[PDB]
């Protein structure tokens, strides 16, 4: 399983962000709004293939979460679909980026702003978000935003859609890597 692939909780479906590790312990990052209130994660809608259990969740304010793998046999590719990921970097205005999600697949665009505040309502406000002109739709949450072999962010949300075009906000991945002391591979 790799970045952009579907992940299922007891509540719904999101996408795997990046496979990361600390020492010999493997985890995967995804959106905090997906990990919030989620315990177990599965690889299929039938919930027969277990992936792991939620180890951390930060939402709102930030939007990232981490899941510890408990499945010993499932391959944990350090890629996004076929795309190898070798490092993480900070987003910059004008940077060409690409997102992969379990609903819409792969879409590209550019970073249009940094440090954006997104108010999802009901007190669910997230800060320091990367703004882009890349589309995203329900199910794409937590999927990776990358630039070549560089990991950049995790899909949080936005407006519009892939048909008419939209605006999507991403949580900077560097912040998540630092919080959990993990690294991409």
């Amino acid at each position: 399983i790799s970045g952009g692939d579907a992940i299922y909780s007891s509540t719904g479906r999101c996408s795997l962000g990046f496979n990361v590790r600390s020492g010999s312990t493997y985890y995967f990052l995804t959106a905090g709004h997906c990990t919030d209130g989620a315990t177990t994660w599965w690889a299929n809608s039938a919930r027969t293939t277990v992936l792991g259990t939620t180890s951390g969740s930060s939402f709102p304010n930030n939007d990232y979460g981490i899941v510890r793998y408990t499945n010993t046999t499932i391959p944990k590719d350090g890629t996004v679909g076929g795309q190898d990921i070798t490092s993480a970097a900070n987003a910059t205005v004008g940077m060409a980026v690409t997102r992969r999600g379990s609903t819409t697949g792969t879409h590209s665009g550019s970073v249009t702003a940094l440090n954006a505040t997104v108010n999802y309502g009901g007190g669910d406000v997230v800060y320091g978000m990367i703004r882009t002109n890349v589309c995203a739709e329900p199910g794409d949450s937590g999927g990776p935003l990358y630039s070549g072999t560089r990991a950049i962010g995790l899909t949080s949300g936005g407006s519009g859609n892939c048909s008419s075009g939209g605006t999507t906000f991403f949580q900077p991945v560097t912040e998540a890597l630092v919080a959990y002391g993990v690294s991409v591979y």
Binding site: T103, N119, G158
Partner: protein, 51 residues
């Protein structure tokens, strides 16, 4: 599902589908409620889950 707190300028992108009276499956409550507002209150909920 109540859409009084709508519309909202952005929605998170998790998938928990709802079926609207227009036979369209809406990806989540936020997407559904924004559509209801955009329809000026003409769209309604048919049932939970996919259409």
């Amino acid at each position: 599902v109540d859409c009084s707190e709508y519309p909202k300028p952005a929605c998170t992108t998790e998938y928990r589908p709802l079926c609207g009276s227009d036979n369209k499956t809406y990806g989540n409550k936020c997407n559904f409620c924004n559509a209801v507002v955009e329809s000026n209150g003409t769209l309604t909920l048919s049932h939970f889950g996919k259409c």
